[PDB]
Amino acid sequence: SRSYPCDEKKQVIAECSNRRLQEVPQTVGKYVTELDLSDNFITHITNESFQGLQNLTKINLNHNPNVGLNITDGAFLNLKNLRELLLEDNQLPQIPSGLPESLTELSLIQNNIYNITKEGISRLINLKNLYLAWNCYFNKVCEKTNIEDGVFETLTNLELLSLSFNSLSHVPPKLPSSLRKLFLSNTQIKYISEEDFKGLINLTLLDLSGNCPRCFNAPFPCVPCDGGASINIDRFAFQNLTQLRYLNLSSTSLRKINAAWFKNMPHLKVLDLEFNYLVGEIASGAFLTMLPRLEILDLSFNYIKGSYPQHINISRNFSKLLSLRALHLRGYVFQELREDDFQPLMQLPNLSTINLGINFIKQIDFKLFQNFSNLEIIYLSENRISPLDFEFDPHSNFYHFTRPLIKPQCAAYGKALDLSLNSIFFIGPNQFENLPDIACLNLSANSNAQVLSGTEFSAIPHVKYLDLTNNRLDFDNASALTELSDLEVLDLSYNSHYFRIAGVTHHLEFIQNFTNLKVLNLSHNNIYTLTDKYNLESKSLVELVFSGNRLDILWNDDDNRYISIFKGLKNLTRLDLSLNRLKHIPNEAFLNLPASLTELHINDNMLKFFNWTLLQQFPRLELLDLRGNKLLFLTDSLSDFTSSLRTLLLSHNRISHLPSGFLSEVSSLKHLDLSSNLLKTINKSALETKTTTKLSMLELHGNPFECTCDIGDFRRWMDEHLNVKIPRLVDVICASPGDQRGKSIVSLE
Amino acid sequence: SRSYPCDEKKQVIAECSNRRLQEVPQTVGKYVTELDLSDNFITHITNESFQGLQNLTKINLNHNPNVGLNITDGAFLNLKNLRELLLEDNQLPQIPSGLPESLTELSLIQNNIYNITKEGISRLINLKNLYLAWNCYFNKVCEKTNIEDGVFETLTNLELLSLSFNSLSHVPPKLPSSLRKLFLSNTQIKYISEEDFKGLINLTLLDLSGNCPRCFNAPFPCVPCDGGASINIDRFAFQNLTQLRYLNLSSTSLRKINAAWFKNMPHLKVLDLEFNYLVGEIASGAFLTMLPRLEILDLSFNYIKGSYPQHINISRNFSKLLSLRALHLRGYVFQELREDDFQPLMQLPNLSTINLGINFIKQIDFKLFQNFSNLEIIYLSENRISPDFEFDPHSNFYHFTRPLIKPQCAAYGKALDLSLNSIFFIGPNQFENLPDIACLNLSANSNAQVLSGTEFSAIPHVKYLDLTNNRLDFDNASALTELSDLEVLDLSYNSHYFRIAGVTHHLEFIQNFTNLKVLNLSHNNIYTLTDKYNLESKSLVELVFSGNRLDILWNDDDNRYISIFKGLKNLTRLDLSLNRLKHIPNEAFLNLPASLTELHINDNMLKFFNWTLLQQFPRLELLDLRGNKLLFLTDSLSDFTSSLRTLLLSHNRISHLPSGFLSEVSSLKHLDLSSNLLKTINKSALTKLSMLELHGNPFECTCDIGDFRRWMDEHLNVKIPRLVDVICASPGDQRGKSIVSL
Ligand SMILES: *[C@@H]1O[C@H](CO)[C@@H](O[C@@H]2O[C@H](CO)[C@@H](O[C@@H]3O[C@H](CO)[C@@H](O)[C@H](O)[C@@H]3O)[C@H](O)[C@H]2NC(C)=O)[C@H](O)[C@H]1NC(C)=O
Ligand SMILES: *[C@@H]1O[C@H](CO)[C@@H](O[C@@H]2O[C@H](CO)[C@@H](O[C@@H]3O[C@H](CO)[C@@H](O)[C@H](O)[C@@H]3O)[C@H](O)[C@H]2NC(C)=O)[C@H](O)[C@H]1NC(C)=O
Ligand SMILES: *[C@@H]1O[C@H](CO)[C@@H](O[C@@H]2O[C@H](CO)[C@@H](O[C@@H]3O[C@H](CO)[C@@H](O)[C@H](O)[C@@H]3O)[C@H](O)[C@H]2NC(C)=O)[C@H](O)[C@H]1NC(C)=O
Ligand SMILES: *[C@@H]1O[C@H](CO)[C@@H](O[C@@H]2O[C@H](CO)[C@@H](O[C@@H]3O[C@H](CO)[C@@H](O)[C@H](O)[C@@H]3O)[C@H](O)[C@H]2NC(C)=O)[C@H](O)[C@H]1NC(C)=O
Ligand SMILES: *[C@@H]1O[C@H](CO)[C@@H](O[C@@H]2O[C@H](CO)[C@@H](O)[C@H](O)[C@H]2NC(C)=O)[C@H](O)[C@H]1NC(C)=O
Ligand SMILES: *[C@@H]1O[C@H](CO)[C@@H](O[C@@H]2O[C@H](CO)[C@@H](O)[C@H](O)[C@H]2NC(C)=O)[C@H](O)[C@H]1NC(C)=O
Ligand SMILES: CCCCCc1cc2c(CCCCN)cccc2nc1N
Ligand SMILES: CCCCCc1cc2c(CCCCN)cccc2nc1N
Ligand SMILES: *[C@@H]1O[C@H](CO)[C@@H](O)[C@H](O)[C@H]1NC(C)=O
Ligand SMILES: *[C@@H]1O[C@H](CO)[C@@H](O)[C@H](O)[C@H]1NC(C)=O
Ligand SMILES: *[C@@H]1O[C@H](CO)[C@@H](O)[C@H](O)[C@H]1NC(C)=O
Ligand SMILES: *[C@@H]1O[C@H](CO)[C@@H](O)[C@H](O)[C@H]1NC(C)=O
Ligand SMILES: *[C@@H]1O[C@H](CO)[C@@H](O)[C@H](O)[C@H]1NC(C)=O
């Protein structure tokens, strides 16, 4: 039977999140092994709350109540199989007493716990991972964290322990030697002694970041060690961490890096040294000799304040980082990159990524990149290159964003060069001389206003994916970009600047001159007028994104010119016409859409009416997205007009009535979205059929249902069609009558 | 009493526009002089739609039924004072028969009327103006316009006649010589004979634009005359048009201008010559010696296709344009503008606007603007300088009629607009040799620099500075301080660097201006600042801070911005819209300046509001909390303020109005409670009140509402806009109805 109020499934997982629930549901399936109740309004947990759910291994209770959680002594003690328990963001004032001995993972991130004690933790001898971070931090009103001596030593299976963003003052003593990962970032620990990590011969991660932070231009309330001194690490603090892979020392105000810290640290993979004062060490770097297995090195944001050196000064000793794959030098800040300045990097056999974002670089000697063994990612974004509930996510890196530097879709094609966010307002004849064979290029947001004529990319003719978004291109020549015969993806989003001017020219004819162009983005260009050729044409093109233009104007009733604007795109399967302010589509215009389409989006327009008949012309059409329009009526004979349609999206429309058979007219329909509409009911007329329906999803939330015996039939139909998934029954709600107002439609008797 | 469904006044005008009306309503005030039914769903009009309203001078039925309008003969012919009748955009297939003799103003703009007959027109002998434009145009399905011979010679009081955007072929013969203004744009009239206008000796305006149009890059379906040829104007076509003030020959494919066309028209004020092929004529141009009283000349978009000349070629004969005030030369298209290129224009005494928009100029000798008599507006926007229906039938078709520079900037003095170029930084000499610019636009140049107190030294008297839509690097606390007279600064849309935590953002310079009055930091995405976390000014009167991240700046774990605005000691107007505020910390709200009269926190996400804090804002007059998620109102409003005249609360979630909220609301004139969740209004809640807005609420229309219905009827001094939209949610029988209809 239809579970409630949780969406249940096998993988047995109850998904009961974000549901305005005020108590723990007692109507949960008893085979459930994992239960997600995050983001609810639950305020009390007692021993009665999971009475029948003894089969539970995982409970999530983060963010309860959503806009503190009173949990009773021993409330979960009976859950003999409970292993993972998530209590984040719950204003707990202490570790709840009497937690079950069977727990392996516990997270108390983002509470008010300032006392960690034997009574709460020491019995939990099976803990693999303990998360206690972010309980006292910044200007939060909270106390220094008291850690009862030995609380952790009974935890002889503890693999992870995280205490970051608490005021600790010292590494706690008596840590179990089972530790693999220790996070102590922003714990206000000024000094590290030789005893602090003495027996942690299995550690692979240590995070001492944010202790003695560098506070200039801090995006948070930041207090430095006195005088802005550096963290102080004893020469022997890492003597026995021979398993260390990851070390984070970002924002510890280091001027000097002791080579001997790495003496017995032969597996170090990742060394994070952001937001220190290391410009000097970058020019000498004894320590670099100690790290020939290091793969990622991050020296970002060590700029000296107020200084703008002509050049970056990299020590010869970078040449010893022989396993280096990625070097991050954001925010060093310098004027000019010369070939000689990167000599020490040129022979590193596996250095694939070099990242120079946000250095305010004015000039680069591009030929230098050829001399490298094999750069795959040249990231120069954000420079000054001109022509030739709570703010921070406690589960993320705090000092840098973790997404890929270049979109993967682009980088897969080959070597990439990103010059986004510079002032390259114009591509000169030699701008791309001496580059490697670039497959992926990003020039987004250079305020580029030029006329691309067919020669500007000649020096790098094999670009397969080109990003020219957020420029101001002047499409005044029909040969534009044609020197890129291999081109497969082209993004021209956000170049409206000239497109919006009726009087200037707009030539899109070059689209035809490409044999392998598969994807094209013309979104948010405000396209309403083109010169000479009113048609887009390509034999290769599979996908055109045309959202945010003015098809309203292009297909107005007094203008025939653009009636076939898309017909010439013979191979097209995917078309996005969202955000074109369409009030009505002329039938000839619609019939002139490519018959090859499988996926058509006309969402978020203003359609009042949709000629359904016209689907006869679209035999391969699988998906149709009309969400967010003004639609009033559905055709009563839809199966007459398509037999390919698998997905139909109609949410946020003005449909108040279904025609008979609709749900069974189908017949390839598997997903039908009728949410946020005006349906007051579903009559048995719509439920009639002679055929087996194959519908697997039907979306109904957001409809103002009439909750009387007048709706029993649909309710019946729901019981007799468990196979049809219907999401968020708690949101499929009665508008009326009074007694029923607010309840799910599934819970009226 | 309360009019329904219209909104009546003597300021005697019944505003009945856009109220979803199915037919002309019987319930209009009998003393109404002007009635606006435009944008309703009316489909039929007859001899008894207006029966009681014999005192009506104006009717507006434009755009009905709003998504054809059947009008019977004589439907209107009882209305004996009826002077102005607007019937635009109604799908009328013929002029209606039986219109009153009394008519002076008739618009039938945008219908389906292709016969202009004596039957419809000739009896209307008092017509002053007749609009018939846009009935057959572009690829519309429509027929050539048949104009019955002499149809207009009955109309011997006719002042303006408009026939644009109709297929005419020839100027109609037999036109009343009462005409001052004749609009024949886009009427396919390829030939202008000596006879066509000979009679009309009182013409002040003639529009022959778009006949033999220049079709390259047309924003509409465009049919050139054959071989793209020029309109044919006969030597003596304008011989007797001695009163002409306005002449529009835009897009008539002229290559040559006959100087003697202007011989007998020495009072010509405004001459429009856009979208022609007049580059040759611009360089030589006899006709320029024949325009002694001309004020406005537009020669925009005469570019030669494919052409990119080094310099503009301006005939010496421009020096005869002695009364010239404005010269428009958009889209001529040339590379460089030199001093010697503009010598002919320099001695003109009243030339105050030069417009060089959209010319693709790469370089400019700025010193030349100085040697002019008195430029007030130097407009160079959009260049390449480095360091139902589409068109409105009531606007000009070839250009925009908005001012070039915002008048709030131009008022201060000589203005220079370099917007939408590529001046990505301001070098040390960018502004040498300029006039004393008072108003300066640099919007949208992708400017990435660190302004530092010296970049505007050469034009230190700027008072309104627009740097919107750049990417400024605010890394120096002396930024802009050279402009000590600055009164307006617009830094909207420079979020490029603000959005990056790791770069610095210095906003200290604000305090360093003694006369800064208005500052706009909107849509900068500001969530972090460097060293100085506070904005301060002793002068600043207004700060716009919408589109930033006060949700972050005032979040609970950070105290640093708790006083971000308090040092704006003089501030009366503050705008914190669009800052994603879920809540505002009490101390933060208390630290907003005490001198505030006007505060907007609209379009945020506020779930609650501490009304008690208003006790500390003794001058606050307007409080604007629209578009939030507020769930409740204080019952104790009179205790927290005695200043507030306007309170705006639409688009929230308030479901109960507190007792003593109307009966006590001591200073409060205007209360906008529309689009909330009110289901009824308790008699407990029932005043300096004059406006009260309630549309959009889901009212239960069952008895009591009645007490409130009473209330309305008893205080009519409380205006309640949009009675038609104050609509019942329940029960089923009332669903569509105004609460007032029960
Ligand atoms: C200092 O540097 C260390 C090592 O680079 C950073 O450690 C990484 O911290 C992140 C953020 O918590 C961890 O990400 C999370 O991992 C889990 C487990 O797979 C995943 O479920 C989450 O969605 C999230 O990705 C990351 O695993 C961890 N790295 C390793 C190797 O364990 C640390 O965050 C840095 N400290 C600060 C304050 O930035
Ligand atoms: C301009 O248009 C293109 C084409 O739509 C946009 O690129 C496409 O973006 C979609 C995301 O909407 C990508 O699909 C996603 O791929 C991931 C990766 O495996 C998958 O996990 C997601 O569920 C989703 O399917 C698609 O890969 C991507 N295509 C390409 C060629 O990059 C582009 O983002 C648009 N540009 C702008 C500026 O908005
Ligand atoms: C060709 O040039 C002529 C002369 O400049 C243009 O004349 C102007 O046309 C506009 C648009 O109809 C008139 O504006 C309207 O005037 C009324 C009256 O006050 C006002 O209520 C409207 O809202 C609108 O402003 C304007 O008065 C008229 N100029 C004169 C002196 O009568 C004409 O539009 C041009 N033709 C084309 C096709 O662009
Ligand atoms: C940045 O903020 C300033 C100040 O708010 C904005 O300029 C102001 O814009 C308003 C319109 O929102 C102007 O008010 C209008 O004035 C006219 C003219 O008398 C009146 O008819 C209108 O009803 C309204 O009151 C205001 O004068 C103008 N202020 C100044 C000093 O120019 C500005 O638009 C904002 N910038 C951007 C890019 O959004
Ligand atoms: C090209 O550069 C632009 C600017 O860096 C990239 O845009 C960013 O992309 C990520 C992922 O989509 C977004 O989260 C950021 O919002 C974008 N920044 C801006 C300013 O828009 C773009 O992704 C890069 N393109 C490729 C193909 O790698
Ligand atoms: C400075 O230049 C910009 C760009 O030309 C002007 O912005 C236009 O202003 C009008 C009237 O407010 C708007 O309707 C347009 O949409 C604006 N265009 C753009 C691209 O933003 C701006 O008004 C000019 N500033 C001054 C002070 O005159
Ligand atoms: C890496 C972040 C550096 C932020 C400070 C900062 C430094 C800048 C520099 C380097 C320091 C020069 C100071 N005169 C040059 C140009 C623009 C500069 N803009 C900035 N916002
Ligand atoms: C004023 C409208 C002119 C539109 C055509 C147009 C012409 C342009 C020119 C002049 C044409 C020269 C062709 N090499 C130069 C630079 C950019 C140009 N960009 C354009 N969009
Ligand atoms: C397009 O650009 C090429 C290269 O500049 C040029 O030779 C060709 O003339 C251009 N096309 C047009 C129509 O100007
Ligand atoms: C049609 O699309 C397929 C798949 O992308 C592609 O392989 C083929 O090149 C396309 N057809 C043409 C004529 O380019
Ligand atoms: C759909 O379009 C066809 C022809 O293009 C037309 O005959 C039919 O009337 C239209 N149907 C609807 C319901 O508008
Ligand atoms: C601001 O710029 C000025 C002049 O360009 C320079 O003298 C001054 O040092 C700058 N201030 C800072 C803190 O860099
Ligand atoms: C405060 O505002 C008023 C209005 O502009 C102004 O007259 C006064 O000078 C300002 N105060 C100061 C100290 O500038």
Nearest CA distance, B391 vs chain A (angstrom): 10
Asked whether the bond before B5 is cis by omega within 30 degrees of 0, the reply is yes
Residues 6+ apart with CB under 8 A from A137: A165, A166, A167, A186, B557
Which atom of ligand 5 lies at the shortest distance from residue A416's CA?
A: 28
Residues A205 and A216: beta-carbon distance below 8 Å: no
Residues A5 and A27: beta-carbon distance below 8 Å: yes
Does residue B327 come out as left (phi exceeding 0), alpha (psi in the -120 to 50 range) or beta?
Answer: beta
Does residue A21 come out as left (phi exceeding 0), alpha (psi in the -120 to 50 range) or beta?
Answer: beta
For residue A516, which ligand has an atom nearest its CA?
A: 10
Mutate to test the pocket of ligand 8, among B360, B363, B386, B421 (most ligand atoms within 8 A of CB): B360
Residues B540 and B509: beta-carbon distance below 8 Å: no
User: Using the 8-state DSSP alphabet, how is residue A60 labeled?
Assistant: E
Residues 6+ apart with CB under 8 A from B591: B562, B563, B564, B565, B566
Which backbone phi and psi does B206 adopt, to 5 degrees? -135, 125
Q: In angstroms, rounded to a whole number, what is the distance separating the alpha carbons of residues B214 and B218?
A: 8
- Say which of B221, B384, B559 has its CB closest to residue A561: B221
Which atom of ligand 11 lies at the shortest distance from residue A635's CA?
A: 13
Residues A656 and A679: beta-carbon distance below 8 Å: yes
Give the DSSP H/E element, type plus range, for residue B571. Answer: none
Q: Helices marked H in B447-606 — which ranges? A: 495-498, 550-553, 586-590
What does each C-alpha distance from A402 to A399, A405, A406, B111 come to in angstroms? 10, 9, 12, 60
* Residues on chain A touching B558 (C-beta within 8 angstroms): 138-139, 220-221, 391
Q: In angstroms, rounded to a whole number, what is the distance separating the alpha carbons of residues B59 and B34?
A: 6
Please report where in the chains the tokens 């030593």 appear, as a residue. A153
Q: In angstroms, rounded to a whole number, what is the distance separating the alpha carbons of residues B440 and B464?
A: 6
Name the experiment that determined this structure.
Answer: X-ray
Counting Cβ atoms within 10 Å, is residue A80 exposed (0-12), middle (13-18) or buried (19+)?
A: exposed
Interface check B210 vs A, CB under 8 A: no
Q: Which of B75, B72, B18, B74 is nearest to B41 (CA)?
A: B18
Q: In angstroms, rounded to a whole number, what is the distance separating the alpha carbons of residues A366 and A349?
A: 20
User: Tokens at residue B562, please?
Assistant: 């708790």
Q: In angstroms, rounded to a whole number, what is the distance separating the alpha carbons of residues A103 and A129?
A: 9
Please report where in the chains the tokens 């203008």 appear, as a residue. A559
Q: Is B708 helix (H, G, I), strand (E, B) or coil?
A: helix
Which backbone phi and psi does B296 adopt, to 5 degrees? -120, 125
Residues B418 and B381: beta-carbon distance below 8 Å: yes
Contact at CB, A556 and B389, closer than 8 angstroms? yes
Asked whether the bond before A737 is cis by omega within 30 degrees of 0, the reply is yes
Q: In angstroms, rounded to a whole number, what is the distance separating the alpha carbons of residues A576 and A271?
A: 44
First to last CA, chain B: 16
Neighbours of A52 (CB within 10 A): 12
Neighbours of A242 (CB within 10 A): 15
What does each C-alpha distance from A655 to A628, A630, A674, A700, A725 come to in angstroms? 12, 8, 8, 12, 21
Please report where in the chains the tokens 């963010």 appear, as a residue. A63
Bridge-partner residues for B353, per DSSP?
A: B326, B377
For CA atoms A340, A344, A345, A347, give the dihedral sign.
positive
Q: Which of B666, B660, B651 is nearest to B681 (CA)?
A: B660
Q: Which of A381, A456, A395, A392 is nearest to A426 (CA)?
A: A456
Please report where in the chains the tokens 């219209």 appear, as a residue. B6
Mutate to test the pocket of ligand 7, among A299, A328, A333 (most ligand atoms within 8 A of CB): A333
User: Tokens at residue B550, please?
Assistant: 């006060």
Q: Which of A45, A92, A39, A97 is nearest to A63 (CA)?
A: A39
Contact at CB, B219 and A502, closer than 8 angstroms? yes
Q: Is A715 helix (H, G, I), strand (E, B) or coil?
A: helix
Give the DSSP H/E element, type plus range, for residue A735. Answer: strand A734-736
Residues B133 and B183: beta-carbon distance below 8 Å: yes
DSSP codes, B154-165 = T-TT--EEE--S
Asked whether the bond before B731 is cis by omega within 30 degrees of 0, the reply is yes
Q: In angstroms, rounded to a whole number, what is the distance separating the alpha carbons of residues A52 and A537?
A: 63
User: Tokens at residue A308, please?
Assistant: 């703008």
Q: In angstroms, rounded to a whole number, what is the distance separating the alpha carbons of residues B512 and A716?
A: 74
> Which one-letter amino acid corresponds to residue B591?
N
Neighbours of B29 (CB within 10 A): 17
User: Tokens at residue B587, please?
Assistant: 């101390």
User: Tokens at residue B488, please?
Assistant: 């307006």
Interface check A316 vs B, CB under 8 A: no
Q: In angstroms, rounded to a whole number, what is the distance separating the alpha carbons of residues B535 and B537?
A: 7
Contact at CB, A358 and B503, closer than 8 angstroms? yes
Q: In angstroms, rounded to a whole number, what is the distance separating the alpha carbons of residues B257 and A264?
A: 91
Supply the residue whose CA is at minimum distance from atom 10 of ligand 10: A540
> Which one-letter amino acid corresponds to residue B596?
L
User: Tokens at residue A133, please?
Assistant: 């971070």
Q: In angstroms, rounded to a whole number, what is the distance separating the alpha carbons of residues B355 and B383?
A: 12
Antiparallel, parallel or unpaired: β A7-9 and A13-15? antiparallel
Q: In angstroms, rounded to a whole number, what is the distance separating the alpha carbons of residues A417 and B198?
A: 71
Residues B595 and B572: beta-carbon distance below 8 Å: yes
Q: In angstroms, rounded to a whole number, what is the distance separating the alpha carbons of residues B272 and B397?
A: 12
Please report where in the chains the tokens 């309170």 appear, as a residue. B647
Residues 6+ apart with CB under 8 A from B336: B310, B311, B361, B362, B363, B364, B365
> Which one-letter amino acid corresponds to residue A586?
P
Q: In angstroms, rounded to a whole number, what is the distance separating the alpha carbons of residues B11 and A738?
A: 46
User: Tokens at residue B267, please?
Assistant: 């009072």
Residues 6+ apart with CB under 8 A from B306: none
Residues B389 and B139: beta-carbon distance below 8 Å: no
Q: In angstroms, rounded to a whole number, what is the distance separating the alpha carbons of residues B340 and B320?
A: 17
Antiparallel, parallel or unpaired: β B699-700 and A697-699? unpaired
Contact at CB, A503 and B358, closer than 8 angstroms? yes
Q: In angstroms, rounded to a whole number, what is the distance separating the alpha carbons of residues A190 and A558?
A: 75
Neighbours of B318 (CB within 10 A): 23
Neighbours of A609 (CB within 10 A): 13
Q: Which of A218, A132, A244 is nearest to A398 (CA)?
A: A218
Q: Domain B1-742 is of which CATH architecture?
A: Alpha-Beta Horseshoe (3.80)
Which atom of ligand 8 lies at the shortest distance from residue B301's CA?
A: 1
DSSP codes, A321-390 = -TT--EEE-TT---SEE-GGGGGGGTT-TT--EEE-TTS---EE-GGGGGGSS--SEEE--SS-------
Q: In angstroms, rounded to a whole number, what is the distance separating the alpha carbons of residues A566 and A740?
A: 50
Q: In angstroms, rounded to a whole number, what is the distance separating the alpha carbons of residues B700 and B730?
A: 5
Please report where in the chains the tokens 């653009």 appear, as a residue. A562
For CA atoms B190, B191, B197, B202, give the dihedral sign.
positive
* Residues on chain B touching A526 (C-beta within 8 angstroms): none
Angle at B335 between CA B334 and CA B339, to 5 degrees: 90
A454, HSE (Cβ side, Cα atoms, 13 Å): 11
Interface check A331 vs B, CB under 8 A: yes
Nearest CA in chain A to B139: A558
3-state percent breakdown (helix, strand, coil) of chain A, nearest 5: 15, 15, 70
For residue A510, which ligand has an atom nearest its CA?
A: 9
Residues A330 and A303: beta-carbon distance below 8 Å: no
Please report where in the chains the tokens 């009332």 appear, as a residue. B734
Residues A671 and A697: beta-carbon distance below 8 Å: yes
Q: What CATH code is assigned to A1-749? A: 3.80.10.10
Give the DSSP H/E element, type plus range, for residue A279. Answer: helix A279-283
Q: Which of A20, A139, A129 is nearest to A85 (CA)?
A: A129
Q: In angstroms, rounded to a whole number, what is the distance separating the alpha carbons of residues A605 and A626?
A: 8
Q: In angstroms, rounded to a whole number, what is the distance separating the alpha carbons of residues A401 and A387?
A: 29
Q: Which of A266, A312, A333 is nearest to A293 (CA)?
A: A266
- Say which of B139, B330, B446 has its CB closest to residue A447: B446
Q: In angstroms, rounded to a whole number, what is the distance separating the alpha carbons of residues B519 and B483?
A: 14
Using CA atoms in the order A41, A47, A49, A51, what is the torsion angle rounded to 10 degrees? 170
Does residue A304 come out as left (phi exceeding 0), alpha (psi in the -120 to 50 range) or beta?
Answer: beta
Give the distance (Å) from ligand 13 centre to CA of residue B548. Answer: 26
Please report where in the chains the tokens 């022997």 appear, as a residue. A236
User: Tokens at residue A472, please?
Assistant: 């101001």
Nearest CA distance, A653 vs chain B (angstrom): 18
List the helix and strand counts (H, then E) for chain B: 8, 38
Q: In angstroms, rounded to a whole number, what is the distance separating the alpha carbons of residues B416 and B432?
A: 14
Q: In angstroms, rounded to a whole number, what is the distance separating the alpha carbons of residues A96 and A248?
A: 31
User: Tokens at residue B544, please?
Assistant: 């716009």
Give the distance (Å) from ligand 2 centre to CA of residue A408. Answer: 10
Contact at CB, B557 and A137, closer than 8 angstroms? yes
> Which one-letter amino acid corresponds to residue B70?
N
Q: In angstroms, rounded to a whole number, what is the distance separating the alpha carbons of residues A620 and A639?
A: 14
Residues A84 and A55: beta-carbon distance below 8 Å: no
Q: In angstroms, rounded to a whole number, what is the distance separating the alpha carbons of residues A729 and A688?
A: 23
Residues 6+ apart with CB under 8 A from A665: A637, A638, A639
Please report where in the chains the tokens 């971000």 appear, as a residue. B564
Residues A114 and A140: beta-carbon distance below 8 Å: no
List the helix and strand counts (H, then E) for chain A: 9, 38
What does each C-alpha distance from A243 to A174, A205, A296 come to in angstroms? 19, 9, 17
- Total residue count of chain B as it appears in this document: 742
